[PDB]
Enzyme design. Structure first.
Site, PDB file in Angstrom:
ATOM      1  N   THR A 247      -2.375   8.738  -5.584  1.00 28.53           N
ATOM      2  CA  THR A 247      -1.420   8.878  -4.490  1.00 28.53           C
ATOM      3  C   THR A 247       0.002   8.609  -4.972  1.00 28.53           C
ATOM      4  O   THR A 247       0.896   9.449  -4.815  1.00 28.53           O
ATOM      5  CB  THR A 247      -1.761   7.927  -3.327  1.00 28.53           C
ATOM      6  N   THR A 248       0.225   7.437  -5.574  1.00 26.44           N
ATOM      7  CA  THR A 248       1.584   7.034  -5.921  1.00 26.44           C
ATOM      8  C   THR A 248       2.050   7.685  -7.217  1.00 26.44           C
ATOM      9  O   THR A 248       3.254   7.889  -7.409  1.00 26.44           O
ATOM     10  CB  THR A 248       1.691   5.503  -6.048  1.00 26.44           C
TER      11      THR A 248
ATOM     12  N   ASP B 258       0.855  -1.186   0.000  1.00 30.09           N
ATOM     13  CA  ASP B 258       0.000   0.000   0.000  1.00 30.09           C
ATOM     14  C   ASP B 258       0.892   1.237   0.000  1.00 30.09           C
ATOM     15  O   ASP B 258       1.563   1.531   0.991  1.00 30.09           O
ATOM     16  CB  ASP B 258      -0.933   0.015   1.213  1.00 30.09           C
TER      17      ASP B 258
ATOM     18  N   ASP C 136     -14.677   3.844  -1.574  1.00 29.59           N
ATOM     19  CA  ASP C 136     -14.048   3.726  -2.886  1.00 29.59           C
ATOM     20  C   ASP C 136     -15.063   3.943  -3.999  1.00 29.59           C
ATOM     21  O   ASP C 136     -14.780   4.637  -4.982  1.00 29.59           O
ATOM     22  CB  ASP C 136     -13.391   2.353  -3.047  1.00 29.59           C
TER      23      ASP C 136
END
Lengths: 518, 543, 91, 534
Positions: free
Chosen positions: A81-82, A48, A386
């Protein structure tokens, strides 16, 4: 203590590269695992990206900025996010030979990066495809993308339906030349509140249109539902009445206490009779309610709810129609609960609820989640969020961008061509973004197991001559069309990703000095 | 810098099977093997033990050493626990397990060096054990008939005392056999009711003198003096004895009960009160015909004055165990309270007197030709501190071994002095030779371990093992007039200390071992040896 | 990872017998000048800060209190002589 | 690219340390696999010794330094809550899976390629298991097979001599509590009780319960053929007044008489108890009467009960009282004032055993005790510990077969046959990828760690035992017959496990394969080893 000049510049880029490296291979459907050794002797293999960045200590302020950067992304868009962290780091890396070796002043690199952002944003739009955000079935197919390989995938029709009703309820869907186009303002953080109630199963989740109270009443045993409700919203307490003077009550003799109680009994009764004049079914008082007042109102066949803050009554009035008044004598005959099917006082899981639902949508909803255990309720809540996040991301703009590295590749190719017409010193750092964008399609190949050069070269050729919707197959590693392999992502993710990534790089490039001190 | 592989648990250096953990574990045990090896036999060696409390003793007993040693290495603890097994439900065999188990491990290492696995070795040992246990059943010559005669007892007690105290065997044997014959009932073929607890025989020792003045008392001997005026009872029979747990003084009060005095008259009144209450309690004792009183606690001055005037012998016994044992002599039941020793709770003693043993005066509660006690006391003397203490232990071993004579054929007698061990070597070898495959390798080495006994018996006697052992083997490897061996089932180690040569016949001195002791040692020693062999790694961890 | 001793001492073998003899001879050497009517006196300083002067073997050895676990046997047997006979403890 | 007070392994070193750590854990626990394995010693640091072969005990009581081996130890230990067995098998499978995967990774095979191949092999392995298993006869009366199940479990853990003692104990204890009409069972109905002063070979099965507190009077019955049981919560100790009082006397005679007057309160309660006994088979031959009083009983009243041939127990523990109510069928009487025959239970042979230190009371032979007791005996702690585990392991093994009727011939037949299956199916199907096949080949070879480790411990040549099994299997395939072939760890040649009596459980094999595949994959997919603040 203090680091200055090129040492500060190298330190800022170096630390940013490290943070990007921590999760470099955690992107994609085939993300790799990362072994995090805890100071307490344990360890996890989580992939994660958020937890990995959260649970790793950093020293350099630049690395700390990247950690906060990811938090900002999460608040603005439910995804990316990433992508932000990896792209932001790679941009700084690509700017490194220009900042240090070529001796190009930060002000020139930052200006070039701002122009690269402007051009990149236009390209992301050019490669997008529309969706009909009014067609529920089309939206359900998109929303399920966030539900796959989650527990509740078997009930995804309900998770999508709740997301569709919740987002559309709060969505500002408007366009005109007077107020302007809100651009589908959506707030799924406050106006779609989610509550977990023990009992039932996944499919038993419901959406409420109104106000739900968790406060208990003077008589928990109440008629199952009220078909003809009338609600009283009153500030004034029901207790011994005092005047406008500063007079205090001081009783010394034991026999004289009856004088105050007898006066209170008459005054409280008279106040309660005034409340009962309008034949209420639920009386809500913001201040205290004396024991006698509770009996006078209850015995008439009416629920009494004491000590309810104004912040609740202000919302109750919007869904009941009751007027909020100060004095008991200010109550009106129009204080009724019409335009409502029923009010329900059903207890669920041995917990009291009061459902004030009506036929109106006060720009908000509440979602009831049901399940046979807290673990089930938590999985439903997390998985619904989500569904709501992607429902927001899509309904925020009727457009999708091609995934699989396609969008990022298209931006690289188009920036590279644009660079040809950007004569001047800015041409050099401008390219830095075009190269940086590759970090996404390169990571996907690395996880697939192919050669990062030979497979990327095939992709670049496809974009150079062919369509921009060509990407990397997550499972096979082949270069495939995103038409057959849909992998579509809400455009807001790609727009915010390139925006926040470049802005962060511009910040750290601006810092030629780090100074300690308090 | 230097890398290491295989060490991943708390950084421990923990040897694997391939690193010789078994061989290293055995090497640790060998240190204790040699310590115990020199204990066995009538000529065993002494050891000095210095207790951490500042007490120095000398003993021959290996079990004492093992309990006084702080044993750390788990490989040795396996055998020390095995020693405790010989102490539980058995009164002998401690040296047999420690010595045999060590030798079984020593010969195992010889097999390990060949490439024979610990599994194959253990499997062979288990087979040889089962064979060994069966063969022992056929080596019986005589049997104890459990008639409890002094002479039958001496036959067993003598070889039991031997190897703990040598040269005084006949004196100590009379002391134990006499005391045992005192407590044992006269009966035959009665196995339904258990009797003869080891605690039934006490041993008492005084410094000074020698065993030449030792004796046995039919009753208990207490180290406390007659506190009262009467120091002895009369020559009459059946003196009534009262026993109290309450101190012989004014009764107390459960709650408060504090007396406060403000006036001179109150002092006189309370003083007379207490004196009268004590007299009443002492009077009621005397009025029941009690002539001796035993307290589990102290005695007040007034109680002494009244008990003296009543002619009652006052003897303090503070030990709860002595009071419980007193119930086995006089029969009296200790009174939880004071002043009401119901006649049914009174006991009877024929004689209570003071005796001088070694110069120290003791009080004796005994009977002579009547109302006979169920307890006996053995009286030891000796001037040398270290020797006398060990002699006491020799007495306990004699009594414990008699307990080993139990209903399940505990009386079966096998020739001792190594004669049984030598015959086992021949029989176990034949079992090996008839066994196909690799199993014969461990079965044969199992037999080899059994020569340690005739070897140890020779070494302690000062004999050259290289001449004694081949003479012992030749003595049993003989031609007999028939398949069954007769005269040469009795050839053992001659513990003489002579010069030239030879073996000695068990029949000459009646040296027999108990089957129950032998078969038990064979089981325990094998389990200890195979347990150690099964451990190819030791890992320490927080539990 | 395991040991057998953890500060537990044991010494075995013929060398220990000879070592025991040597310690026991040391006691003899302390007492050997006390034999005979012309025996020499020994000065002992005790923990109580008093000095004892005597050629009496019983007095000397009782105050010596040799610590060695084996030599203490000579102390015990001398005390036995002192109790059983009353003289000859030196011899 | 590193912050101070931190460390990371970025290059392939992260994989080397993960495989190396797993290889260590394997090299320790592989020696505990099979009935011919070795015995590990645990030292608690306080000087206590515990011996075991059990994977779970080894992993959960031993401390591990390597953080990677910790993950394997915990994941394998989790199997105890799923199957109750197979913990060592998982560790062995994980080790070899990582060994074989590493060999291919050295050739440039991306960890994902091996991972996907493992998942393909896993799915086909589960298909093989379902077709490889044998359906057990649904009869619970099949004691002969259930003995084979208990034996196979016990032989792993004990010295094979205790197997002859424990095998019928495990088998009958579980079958005894197995519910009628082919229903389920709860093995918690078998009490595991330890006692000392007897050899481990004396371990015995008790039909009923064994109670700790016995009688405390020399005239208590030794054995009663049949008895009624009084279940009583009323104290029978000398009672005193509930209100302020005292004994005011002018003479010793009055003193004791006054105390006796209060004592009569207990005698009155005793009379009602004795009168009940007199009514219910008072003088009937071959009958007696037992009291299991929850509270204390006065030595005086114990003398009373003994004189009336009543076996009086006192100060019974709650756990015994509640179970005895179920076993005997009686009810707890809260007041003697309402005492009646309706209170009494019934038991068969009731007797006391006298042990040097302790007495034990047996309440066996009941109409429907719905409970068994196993008495585990020994002289040492480690002896009791090893035997206790062996009993609990056998009880779970048999219960699992009774619950799950799927049985698989053991002795390696599953793992060798599966390896051959996967190698052939992979080339016949080619449904993975040209490079993914490397993971399937690695998986098929890794499966052989079990038949190889099992025999390695036996001391027989690991190479011959595999070839011999292959030869027999080839004949069966050419003959178009079904044949289960394993390795005989006593002879060294091949055998038919269905004649020898060596069986594995479906649940153990299913989860051991799935678990080991997941664990090895989780380590192979680790790209970086992160260290911060440690």
């Amino acid at each position: 203590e203090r680091t200055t000049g090129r040492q500060a510049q190298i330190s800022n880029i170096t630390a940013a590269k490290a943070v990007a490296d921590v999760i470099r291979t955690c992107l994609g459907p085939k993300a790799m695992l990362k072994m995090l050794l805890d100071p307490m002797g344990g360890l996890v293999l989580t992939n994660d990206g958020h937890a990995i960045l959260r649970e790793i200590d950093v020293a350099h302020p630049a690395a700390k900025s990247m950690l906060e950067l990811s938090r900002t992304q999460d608040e603005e868009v439910g995804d990316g996010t990433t992508t932000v962290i990896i792209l932001a780091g790679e941009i700084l890396a690509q700017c490194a030979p220009y900042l240090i070796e070529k001796n190009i002043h930060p002000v020139i690199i930052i200006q070039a990066l701002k122009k690269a952002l402007t051009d990149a944003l236009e390209v992301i739009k050019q490669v997008s495809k529309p969706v009909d955000v009014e067609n529920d079935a089309a939206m359900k197919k998109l929303i399920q993308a966030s539900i796959g390989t989650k527990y509740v995938i078997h009930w995804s029709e309900k998770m999508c339906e709740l997301a569709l009703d919740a987002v559309k309820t709060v969505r500002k869907d408007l366009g005109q030349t007077v107020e302007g186009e809100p651009n589908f303002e959506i707030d799924i953080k406050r106006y779609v509140r989610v509550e977990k109630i023990p009992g039932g199963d996944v499919l038993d989740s419901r959406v409420l249109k109104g106000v739900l109270l968790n406060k208990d009443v003077v008589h928990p045993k109440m008629s199952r539902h009220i078909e003809n409700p009338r609600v009283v919203l009153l500030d004034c307490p029901l207790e011994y009445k005092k005047g406008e003077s500063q007079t205090n009550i001081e009783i010394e003799k034991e026999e004289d206490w009856n004088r105050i109680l007898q006066i209170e009994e008459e005054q409280v009764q008279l106040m309660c009779e005034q409340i009962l004049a309008v034949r209420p079914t639920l009386v809500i008082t913001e201040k205290g309610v004396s024991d006698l007042a509770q009996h006078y109102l209850l015995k008439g066949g009416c629920s009494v709810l004491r000590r309810v803050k104004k912040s609740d009554n202000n919302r109750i009035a919007r869904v009941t129609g009751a007027t909020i008044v100060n004095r008991v004598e200010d109550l009106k005959e129009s204080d009724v609960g019409t335009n409502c099917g029923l009010f329900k006082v059903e207890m669920i899981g041995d917990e009291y609820f009061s459902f004030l639902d009506n036929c109106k949508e006060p720009k908000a909803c509440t979602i009831m989640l049901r399940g046979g255990s807290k673990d089930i309720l938590n999985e439903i809540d997390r998985n619904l969020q989500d569904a709501m996040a992607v429902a927001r991301n899509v309904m925020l703009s009727p457009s999708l961008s091609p995934g699989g590295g396609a969008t990022e590749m298209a931006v690289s190719v188009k920036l590279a061509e644009k660079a040809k017409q950007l004569e001047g010193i800015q041409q050099w750092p401008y390219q830095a973004v075009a190269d940086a964008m590759e970090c996404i399609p390169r990571t996907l190949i690395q996880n697939a197991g192919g050669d990062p050069i030979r497979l990327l070269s095939q992709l670049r050729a496809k974009h150079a001559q062919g369509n921009f919707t060509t990407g990397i197959d997550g499972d096979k590693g082949k270069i495939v069309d995103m038409v057959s392999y849909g992998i579509w992502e809400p455009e807001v993710i790609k727009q915010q990703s390139v925006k926040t990534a470049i802005e962060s790089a511009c910040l750290l490039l601006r810092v030629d000095d780090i100074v300690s001190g308090v | 810098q230097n890398p290491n592989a295989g060490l991943f648990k708390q950084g421990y250096n923990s040897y694997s099977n391939a690193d010789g953990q078994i061989i290293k574990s055995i090497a640790a045990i060998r240190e204790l093997h040699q310590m115990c090896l020199t204990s066995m036999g009538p000529c065993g060696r002494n050891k000095i033990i210095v207790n951490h409390l500042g007490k120095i003793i000398i003993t021959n007993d290996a079990a004492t050493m093992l309990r006084e040693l702080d044993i750390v290495h788990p490989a040795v603890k396996v055998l020390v626990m095995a020693t405790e097994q010989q102490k539980i439900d058995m009164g002998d065999g401690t040296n047999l397990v420690m010595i045999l188990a060590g030798e079984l491990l020593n010969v195992s290492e010889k097999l390990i060096s060949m490439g024979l696995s610990a599994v194959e070795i253990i499997q062979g040992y288990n087979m040889a054990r089962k064979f060994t246990l069966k063969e022992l059943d056929e080596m019986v010559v005589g049997e104890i008939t459990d008639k409890n005669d002094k002479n039958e007892l001496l036959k067993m007690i003598k070889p039991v005392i031997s190897s703990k105290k040598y040269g005084s065997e006949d004196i100590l044997s009379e002391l134990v056999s006499e005391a045992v014959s005192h407590v044992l009932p006269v009966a035959q073929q009665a196995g339904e009711i258990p009797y003869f607890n080891v605690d039934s025989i006490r041993v008492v020792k005084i410094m000074g003198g020698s065993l030449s003045n030792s004796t046995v008392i039919k009753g208990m001997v207490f180290n406390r003096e007659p506190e009262g005026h009467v120091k002895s009872l009369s020559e009459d029979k059946k003196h009534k004895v009262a026993v109290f747990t309450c101190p012989l003084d004014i009764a107390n009060t459960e709650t408060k009960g504090t007396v406060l005095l403000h006036n001179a008259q109150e002092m006189l009144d309370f003083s007379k009160g207490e004196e009268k209450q004590i007299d009443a309690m002492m009077k009621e004792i005397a009025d029941m015909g009690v002539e001796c009183i035993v307290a589990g606690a102290g005695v007040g001055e007034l109680a002494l004055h009244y008990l003296n005037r009543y002619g009652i012998l006052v003897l303090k016994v503070p030990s709860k165990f002595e009071l419980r044992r007193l119930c086995r002599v006089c029969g009296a039941t200790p009174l939880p309270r004071l002043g009401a020793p119901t006649p049914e709770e009174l006991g009877l003693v024929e004689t209570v007197k003071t005796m001088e043993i070694g110069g120290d005066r003791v009080t004796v509660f005994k009977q002579e030709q009547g109302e006979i006690s169920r307890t006996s006391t053995i009286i030891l003397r000796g001037a040398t501190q270290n020797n006398l203490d060990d002699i006491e232990r020799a007495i306990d071993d004699g009594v414990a071994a008699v307990k080993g004579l139990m209903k399940p054929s505990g009386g079966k007698l096998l020739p001792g002095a190594g004669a049984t061990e030598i015959e086992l070597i021949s029989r176990i070898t034949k079992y090996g030779e008839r066994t196909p495959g690799l199993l014969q390798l461990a079965i044969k080495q199992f037999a080899v371990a059994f020569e340690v006994v005739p070897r140890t018996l020779a070494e302690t006697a000062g004999l050259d093992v290289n001449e004694v052992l081949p003479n012992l083997y030749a003595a049993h490897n003989v031609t007999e007039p028939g398949a069954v061996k007769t005269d040469h089932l009795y050839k053992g180690v001659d513990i003489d200390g002579e010069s030239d040569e030879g073996v000695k016949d068990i029949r000459e001195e009646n040296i027999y071992d108990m089957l129950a002791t032998k078969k038990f040692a064979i089981n325990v020693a094998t389990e200890a040896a195979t347990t150690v062999l099964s451990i190819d790694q030791i890992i320490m961890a927080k539990k | 990872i395991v040991v057998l001793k953890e500060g537990t001492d044991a010494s075995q073998g013929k060398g220990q017998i000879i070592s025991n003899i040597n310690a026991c001879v040391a006691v003899q050497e302390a007492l050997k000048p006390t034999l005979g009517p012309l025996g020499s006196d020994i000065l002992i300083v005790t923990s109580n800060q008093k000095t004892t002067i005597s050629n009496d073997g019983a007095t000397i050895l009782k105050l010596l209190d040799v610590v060695h676990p084996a030599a203490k046997t000579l102390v015990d047997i001398s005390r036995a002589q002192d109790a059983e006979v009353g003289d000859g403890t030196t011899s | 690219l590193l912050n101070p007070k931190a460390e990371s392994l970025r290059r392939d070193a992260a994989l080397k340390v993960n495989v190396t750590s797993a290889e260590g854990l394997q090299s320790v626990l592989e020696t505990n696999l099979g009935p011919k394995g070795t015995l590990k010693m645990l030292v608690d640091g306080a000087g206590n010794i515990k011996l075991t072969k059990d994977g779970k005990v080894l992993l959960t009581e031993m401390q591990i330094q390597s953080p990677t081996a910790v993950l394997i130890a915990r994941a394998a230990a989790a199997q105890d809550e799923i199957t109750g067995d197979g913990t060592t098998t998982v560790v062995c499978l994980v080790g070899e899976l990582l060994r074989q995967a590493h060999r291919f990774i050295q050739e440039g095979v991306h960890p994902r390629i091996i991972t996907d191949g493992f998942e393909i092999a896993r799915k086909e392995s589960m298909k093989f298991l379902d077709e490889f298993k044998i359906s057990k006869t649904n009869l619970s009366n099949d004691r002969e097979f259930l003995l084979q199940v208990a034996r196979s479990s016990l032989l792993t853990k004990v010295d094979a001599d205790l197997t002859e003692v424990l095998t019928p104990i495990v088998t009958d204890a579980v079958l005894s509590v197995y519910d009628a009409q082919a229903d389920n069972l709860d093995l918690h109905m078998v009490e595991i009780m330890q006692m000392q002063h007897l050899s481990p070979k004396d371990t015995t099965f008790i039909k009923g319960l064994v109670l700790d507190h016995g009688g405390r009077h020399p005239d208590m019955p030794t054995r009663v053929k049949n008895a009624y049981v009084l279940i009583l919560n009323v104290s029978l100790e000398y009672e005193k007044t509930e209100v302020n009082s005292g004994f005011f006397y002018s003479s010793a005679d009055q003193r004791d008489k006054l105390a006796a007057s209060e004592r009569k309160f207990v005698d009155a309660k005793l009379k009602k108890i004795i009168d009940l006994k007199n009514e219910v088979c008072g003088m009937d031959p071959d009958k007696g009467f037992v009291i299991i009083n929850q509270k204390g009983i006065d030595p005086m009243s114990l003398d009373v009960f003994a004189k009336h041939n009543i076996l009086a127990l006192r100060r019974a523990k709650r756990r015994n009282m509640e179970r005895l109510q179920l076993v005997t069928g009686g009810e707890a009487q809260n007041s003697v004032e309402d005492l009646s025959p309706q209170i009494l239970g019934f038991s068969g042979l009731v007797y006391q055993e006298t042990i040097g230190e302790e007495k034990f009371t047996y309440v066996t032979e009941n109409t429907d005790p719905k409970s068994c007791t196993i008495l585990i005996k020994g002289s040492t702690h480690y002896a009791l510990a090893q035997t206790k585990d062996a009993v609990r392991d056998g009880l779970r093994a048999v219960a699992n077969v009774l619950k799950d009727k799927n049985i698989i011939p053991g002795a390696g037949a599953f793992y060798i046959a599966l390896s051959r299956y996967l190698r052939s199916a992979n080339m016949n199907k080619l449904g993975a990828k040209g490079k993914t096949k490397t993971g399937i080949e690695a998986f098929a070879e890794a499966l052989l760690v079990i038949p190889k480790t099992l025999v390695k411990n036996s001391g027989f040549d690991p190479l011959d035992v595999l070839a011999m099994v292959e030869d027999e299997l080839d004949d069966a395939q050419d003959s178009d017959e079904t044949r289960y072939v394993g390795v005989d760890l006593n002879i060294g040649d091949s055998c038919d496990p269905t004649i020898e009596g060596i069986w594995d459980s479906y649940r153990v094999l299913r989860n051991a394969i799935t678990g080991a595949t997941g664990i090895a994959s989780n380590l192979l997919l680790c790209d970086e080893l992160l260290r911060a603040g440690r």
